[PDB]
Design a binder for these strands. Structure first.
Ligand SMILES: [Zn+2]
Lengths: 129, 143, 368, 108
RNA sequence: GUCGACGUACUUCAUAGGAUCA
RNA sequence: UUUUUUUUU
């Protein structure tokens, strides 16, 4: 059955932006989907989006704008130490200075070049480029 | 039969090098996830100056929007853009004319046919991505 | 064969043709071929009466096929040309061989043939056409020049001498008889047709000339592949597997790189080295054969064909648009290229109606 | 009126045309047998050529050189070759067909 | 016992396709 | 590897 809700969300965005649509509807929406999306939004990969509220898990509607090449999830949330940041970003990005690996640290959900500055690490969620 | 060439040494190729990229060097770089500038540093162990020709850039722009990440990689600011005095023709032909007219570039490419036609010309080393990195063939200053 | 004779006496409508008071009765074969051919000529049917256009053919002093190829050609002002062909072939040996009249003197003989060959090349502008366009352009240049001076012109390029004064007489006869049947004199552009002499033809109407002369030479078909050619006139089912060949007297005796691949002839004869001699050609490929093979039982069809881009569409229960391949040989024959034929069903048969082209078929299959 | 009865007999004859075509297409969909599909494809390509500009060719050649999809480093072909399976001449037919198709694309 | 079923070891058969020229 | 004697609107 349904296990990763974030994987469903990123796969629905990915499919419905490959084919050229303009706004996407993704049901359910945890706190993690909001924070992962705010990280994608800060860097310009998606437009605004909005959480519509039933009295249930809740749905989101995202406004895409083209600039997104791929996004995904890394499915066992592997613990990542502080050198393994750079082994991870060499495995899953097509050129080692664009795209952001996104990871869950004790100081928030953030990309990797923000977790370099603050000197933290944590688990690993996904990626965008 | 230029004044630099030995029997087959070709000693006008020296650090820092100048490589010419083909259109399917970029594809297999994106596929095997090596990076252009540091990949050539990690094989040649010298500085590099990747160059891309107007015929090749036209070919990249001809692919379309499914291959737009490779185009994003090719418009990168530190890949210089050598301009070429051509009608505007097939890429591999423009590479061969560059090689014959100056004999001081090494050629990074991956198609077998262009590999053969370069190999006839004596003294032109020939990088190509294989496996996991940028293997170089006919360069006598390796290690 | 006896075909214009029985044409005229069935134009008088004497139905029992075998019971005519002959001085001595000729063979059945020529009469039977007359019946059949003039059915393909669009002149007769099994209805035992000629057509109205068959009666109009009887109003012409020519061969039945010659009269037809004038008759149907009354379209788009291309008539002086068909007059030139129908009167040029109507008397034999239009050009001297220049091979049998005597560097050295055989070299100068062959050089006379070479210079006449250069002339005949310089006459024809459409290589694909036939030996027809040779004699057409010869007539178009002969009366182009002043005929007071044409004799030195007529012997500059080493041609024949009297049958074209006869062709001027015959031309005046033919346009006079057309004037007599129909008032065609005082019309404006028909001065082209009313030209007692001959001038330069059109540019696209000449392929339409190939169309309307395909209407003339019925049941005389071949291909090309050194010549290597069978007769593709499979309505006679026994004229295949044989290497048939152009008449060497015709200038189309192996013109280097002659393109086309449907070969229309006038007639043929056999002889030396068992070589065959198909006389007067016309060269066509795809649509205008079946445009003017529908005119009789020269041509039938198959069931519709299919795949992708070739799917039959139904506009109604009794009306459709389908690609079809046209069959041509009766008991042993072959097939042309397919066509987007649009048809309906009258009394239990999908009867073909219209020849839709490719893009029209794409629209008509978009709509459903 | 009575023109309704005309309408019903029209929709009836459309429905039975639809049903006969659907029955035919079902029975043909079940026949996968590579000689039968191969024959149907051959005579289709013949009829396509008989019955039914460089820029599209240059885009196709560009994508083919970018991709190199029709050479024996592909998974199917490298599998067949490396396991001695293409000495049987039918899979060699298929492999040569791949290679000539790619060679058609790379021609100029 | 020129025995069978295996288990190891090895051998061998299936490779040409297009284009131009004669 | 041309092989047209002859003829009537
Ligand atoms: Zn160039």
């Amino acid at each position: 059955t349904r296990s990763s809700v974030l994987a469903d969300a990123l796969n629905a965005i990915n499919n419905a932006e490959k084919t050229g649509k303009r706004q996407v509807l993704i049901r359910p929406s945890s706190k993690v989907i909001i924070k992962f999306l705010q990280v994608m939004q800060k860097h310009g990969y998606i437009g605004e989006f909005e959480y519509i509220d039933d009295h249930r898990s809740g749905k989101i509607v995202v406004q895409l704008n083209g600039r997104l090449n791929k996004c995904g999830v890394i499915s066992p949330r592997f613990n990542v130490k502080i050198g393994d940041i750079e082994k991870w970003t060499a495995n899953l990005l097509p050129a080692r200075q664009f795209g952001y690996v996104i990871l869950t640290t004790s100081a928030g959900i953030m990309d990797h070049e923000e977790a370099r500055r603050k000197h933290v690490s944590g688990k690993i969620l996904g990626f965008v480029y | 039969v230029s004044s630099a060439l030995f029997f087959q040494y070709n000693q006008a190729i020296k650090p820092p090098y100048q490589v010419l990229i083909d259109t399917n060097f970029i594809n297999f770089s994106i596929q095997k996830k090596v990076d252009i500038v540091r990949g050539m540093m990690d094989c040649l162990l010298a500085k590099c100056n990747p160059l891309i020709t107007d015929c090749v850039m036209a070919e990249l722009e001809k692919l379309g929007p499914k291959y737009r990440i490779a185009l994003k990689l090719a418009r990168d600011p530190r890949i210089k853009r050598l301009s070429c005095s051509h009608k505007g023709t097939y890429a591999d032909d423009c590479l061969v004319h560059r090689v014959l007219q100056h004999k001081c570039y090494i050629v990074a490419t991956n198609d077998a046919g262009l590999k053969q036609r370069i190999r006839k010309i004596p003294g032109i080393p020939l990088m190509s991505v294989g496996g996991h990195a940028y293997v170089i063939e006919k360069l006598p200053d390796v290690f | 064969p006896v075909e214009s004779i029985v044409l005229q006496m069935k134009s008088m409508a004497i139905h029992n043709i075998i019971n005519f008071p002959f001085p001595t009765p000729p063979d059945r074969v020529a009469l039977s071929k007359a019946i059949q051919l003039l059915q393909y000529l669009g002149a007769l049917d099994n209805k035992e009466m000629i057509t109205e256009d068959g009666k109009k053919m009887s109003l012409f002093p020519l061969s039945p096929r010659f009269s037809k190829m004038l008759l149907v050609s009354d379209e788009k002002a291309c008539l002086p040309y068909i007059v030139a062909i129908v009167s040029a072939l109507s008397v034999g040996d239009p050009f001297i061989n220049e091979f049998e009249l005597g560097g050295m003197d055989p070299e100068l003989k062959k050089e006379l043939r070479s210079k006449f060959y250069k002339s005949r090349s310089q006459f024809s502008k459409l290589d694909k056409f036939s030996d027809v366009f040779r004699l057409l352009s010869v007539v178009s240049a002969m009366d182009y020049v002043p005929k007071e001076q044409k004799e030195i012109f007529m012997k500059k390029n080493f041609l024949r001498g009297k049958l074209m004064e006869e062709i001027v007489k015959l031309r005046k006869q033919l346009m006079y008889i057309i004037k007599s049947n129909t008032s065609k004199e005082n019309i404006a552009v028909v001065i082209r047709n009313e030209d007692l002499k001959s001038d330069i033809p059109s540019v696209i109407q000449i392929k339409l000339l190939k169309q309307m002369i395909c209407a003339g030479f019925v049941d005389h078909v071949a291909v090309r592949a050194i010549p290597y050619i069978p007769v593709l006139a499979t309505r006679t089912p026994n004229i295949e597997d044989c290497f048939v060949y152009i008449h060497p007297t015709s200038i189309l005796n192996n013109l280097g790189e002659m393109p086309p691949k449907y070969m229309l002839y006038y007639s043929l004869h056999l002889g030396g080295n068992n070589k065959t001699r198909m006389n007067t050609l016309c060269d066509i490929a795809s649509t205008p054969l079946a445009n003017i093979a529908r005119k009789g039982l020269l041509l039938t069809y198959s069931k519709p064909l299919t795949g992708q881009g070739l799917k039959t569409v139904n506009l109604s229960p009794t009306e459709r648009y389908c690609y079809v391949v046209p069959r041509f040989g009766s008991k042993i024959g072959w097939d042309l290229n397919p066509i987007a034929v649009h048809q309906k069903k009258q009394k239990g048969q999908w009867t073909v109606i219209k020849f839709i082209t490719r893009k029209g078929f794409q629209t008509i299959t978009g709509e459903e | 009126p009575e023109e309704m009865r005309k309408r019903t007999t029209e929709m009836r004859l459309m429905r039975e045309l639809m049903f006969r075509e659907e029955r035919k297409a079902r029975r043909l969909k079940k026949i996968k047998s590579k000689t039968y599909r191969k024959i149907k494809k051959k005579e289709l390509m013949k009829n396509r050529e008989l019955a039914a500009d460089n820029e599209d060719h240059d885009i196709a050649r560009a994508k083919e050189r970018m991709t190199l999809k029709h050479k024996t480093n592909s998974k199917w072909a490298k599998d067949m070759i490396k396991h001695g399976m293409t000495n049987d001449a039918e899979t060699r037919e298929e492999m040569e067909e791949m290679l000539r198709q790619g060679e058609r694309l790379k021609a100029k």
